[PDB]
Amino acid sequence: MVDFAFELRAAQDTGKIVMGARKSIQYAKMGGAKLIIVARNARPDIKEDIEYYARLSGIPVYEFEGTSVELGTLLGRPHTVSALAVVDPGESRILALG
């Protein structure tokens, strides 16, 4: 089974990710992400924007079962992260969550 915490970090370290709603939506729009991760407490219109643009491109969205606080901490940031996009998984198995 896919270890979220471990595979997210593995993607961060060996692949390419962009963080935050703005970048996530932008990469969704341009069809440039392989997966978009959204925190459970992401602002309703941000969730709905991501889901829309991702659906247009056939990019899977995964809702993280935790707050933007926990997601930030997982990503090693001392701030909230409401969404992120996996551009290149690298050695990560994170895309299986799609």
Tally Cβ neighbours within 10 Å of residue 33.
Answer: 29
Tokens representing 77 are 């940031």
Contact 39, 68 (CB under 8 A): yes
Domains of the chain: 1-98 (3.30.1330.30)
Sheet with strand 83-88: strands edge to edge: 16-19, 83-88, 35-39, 61-64
HSE, CB side, 13 Å, CA atoms: give it for residue 43. 8
Contact 57, 28 (CB under 8 A): yes
Please provide the DSSP assignment of 52-77 as one string.
HHHHHHT--EEEESS-HHHHHHHTT-
Label residues 59-74 b or e (16+ Cβ within 10 Å = b): bbbbebebbbebbbbb
At 7 the three-state DSSP class reads: helix
